[PDB]
Scaffold this motif. Structure first.
Motif, mmCIF file in Angstrom:
data_model
loop_
_atom_site.group_PDB
_atom_site.id
_atom_site.type_symbol
_atom_site.label_atom_id
_atom_site.label_comp_id
_atom_site.label_asym_id
_atom_site.label_seq_id
_atom_site.Cartn_x
_atom_site.Cartn_y
_atom_site.Cartn_z
ATOM 1 N N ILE A 68 0.834 -1.225 0.000
ATOM 2 C CA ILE A 68 0.000 0.000 0.000
ATOM 3 C C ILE A 68 0.865 1.270 0.000
ATOM 4 O O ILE A 68 1.891 1.357 0.691
ATOM 5 C CB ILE A 68 -0.959 -0.010 1.247
ATOM 6 N N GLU A 71 2.085 7.561 0.570
ATOM 7 C CA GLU A 71 1.825 8.904 0.011
ATOM 8 C C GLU A 71 2.964 9.911 0.238
ATOM 9 O O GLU A 71 2.851 11.132 0.207
ATOM 10 C CB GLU A 71 0.505 9.424 0.586
ATOM 11 N N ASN A 124 -5.171 2.868 7.789
ATOM 12 C CA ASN A 124 -5.325 3.151 6.379
ATOM 13 C C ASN A 124 -6.580 3.920 6.054
ATOM 14 O O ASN A 124 -7.638 3.773 6.673
ATOM 15 C CB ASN A 124 -5.324 1.859 5.639
ATOM 16 N N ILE A 125 -6.494 4.832 5.106
ATOM 17 C CA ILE A 125 -7.680 5.585 4.676
ATOM 18 C C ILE A 125 -7.764 5.548 3.143
ATOM 19 O O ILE A 125 -6.934 4.970 2.450
ATOM 20 C CB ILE A 125 -7.734 7.115 5.089
ATOM 21 N N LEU A 126 -8.855 6.034 2.605
ATOM 22 C CA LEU A 126 -9.075 6.100 1.156
ATOM 23 C C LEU A 126 -9.005 7.581 0.737
ATOM 24 O O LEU A 126 -9.885 8.383 1.040
ATOM 25 C CB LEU A 126 -10.453 5.441 0.965
ATOM 26 N N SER A 128 -9.346 10.242 -2.051
ATOM 27 C CA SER A 128 -9.869 10.347 -3.453
ATOM 28 C C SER A 128 -9.980 8.999 -4.141
ATOM 29 O O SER A 128 -9.615 8.783 -5.304
ATOM 30 C CB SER A 128 -8.960 11.249 -4.294
ATOM 31 N N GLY A 129 -10.482 8.014 -3.381
ATOM 32 C CA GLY A 129 -10.605 6.646 -3.872
ATOM 33 C C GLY A 129 -9.363 5.790 -3.651
ATOM 34 O O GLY A 129 -9.401 4.570 -3.684
ATOM 35 N N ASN A 130 -8.178 6.335 -3.420
ATOM 36 C CA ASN A 130 -6.909 5.569 -3.237
ATOM 37 C C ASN A 130 -6.498 5.061 -1.863
ATOM 38 O O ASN A 130 -6.291 5.888 -0.983
ATOM 39 C CB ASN A 130 -5.773 6.431 -3.760
ATOM 40 N N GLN A 131 -6.352 3.762 -1.606
ATOM 41 C CA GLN A 131 -5.903 3.333 -0.247
ATOM 42 C C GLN A 131 -4.548 3.873 0.055
ATOM 43 O O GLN A 131 -3.614 3.728 -0.733
ATOM 44 C CB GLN A 131 -5.737 1.805 -0.038
ATOM 45 N N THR A 132 -4.445 4.437 1.241
ATOM 46 C CA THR A 132 -3.184 5.049 1.741
ATOM 47 C C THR A 132 -2.911 4.606 3.147
ATOM 48 O O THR A 132 -3.786 4.609 3.996
ATOM 49 C CB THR A 132 -3.283 6.552 1.750
#
Ligand SMILES: *[C@@H](CC(=O)OCC)[C@H](C[C@@H]1CCNC1=O)NC(=O)[C@@H](CC(=O)[C@@H](NC(=O)c1cc(C)on1)C(C)C)Cc1ccc(F)cc1
Length: 180
Positions: A68, A71, A124-126, A128-132
């Motif tokens: 994952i 960022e 983990n969060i999403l 703008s749609g992306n798992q981070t």
């Protein structure tokens, strides 16, 4: 007040406005000619550092062990100036941190220090749609233009801001083992 002075010092010596095709971001110089920007800054072959076109020798997008994204993108700049080594301020492990601040440079009229309150390792969060992965959360209404902002406390470089929803703000965690 030492923590606020620490904050302005960190902007003077370790901060810069990284400009890419996606817009301007606060870059954080970590050591020698290495700087970090949000991965969504999306740095190409050359970026502008404080308005100066600079060639990036290598670009490393940071990912956790399970693939994952963190960022965080580590940039190795082609330039004479060397950044002060702030690595000793970087935590070795994940943790929570009460009463934290955000050091802003890009998109700001001037270096600005914002107090975002208590910070929690949020998982983990999403975005703008992306798992981070490895997200530090805080209950502060951060705005567009804040990305790259250095989350910190006196003697502590905790992370760089990457997203938010008008209510909360999220920073990609800085860990010492990433700058080895
Ligand atoms: C900072 C980007 C910037 O300054 O760019 C300069 C050109 C910005 C900060 C947020 C804007 C609104 N509030 C903020 O603090 N970051 C972004 O815009 C990223 C996208 C988001 O942050 C989205 N938020 C969420 O997805 C979200 C999720 C949760 C739990 O809370 N909020 C909103 C704009 C919808 C840009 C980005 C970052 C990482 C990615 F993988 C994709 C996109």
């Amino acid at each position: 007040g030492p923590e606020e002075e620490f904050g302005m010092s960190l902007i003077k010596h370790n901060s810069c406005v990284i400009t890419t095709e996606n817009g301007k971001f606060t870059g954080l110089g970590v050591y020698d000619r290495f700087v970090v920007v949000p991965t969504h800054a999306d740095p190409g072959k050359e970026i502008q550092v404080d308005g100066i076109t600079t060639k990036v020798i290598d670009s490393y997008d940071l990912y956790n062990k399970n693939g994952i994204k963190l960022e965080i993108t580590v940039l190795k700049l082609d330039r004479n100036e060397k950044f002060r080594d702030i690595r000793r301020y970087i935590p070795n492990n994940e943790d929570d941190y009460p009463n934290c601040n955000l050091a802003l440079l890009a998109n700001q009229p001037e270096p600005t220090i914002i107090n975002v309150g208590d910070v929690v390792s949020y998982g983990n969060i999403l975005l703008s749609g992306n798992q981070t992965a490895r997200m530090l959360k805080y209950s502060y209404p951060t705005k567009s233009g804040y990305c790259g902002g250095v989350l910190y406390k006196i003697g502590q470089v905790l992370g760089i801001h990457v997203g938010g929803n008008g209510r909360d703000g999220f920073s990609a965690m800085l860990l010492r083992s990433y700058f080895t």
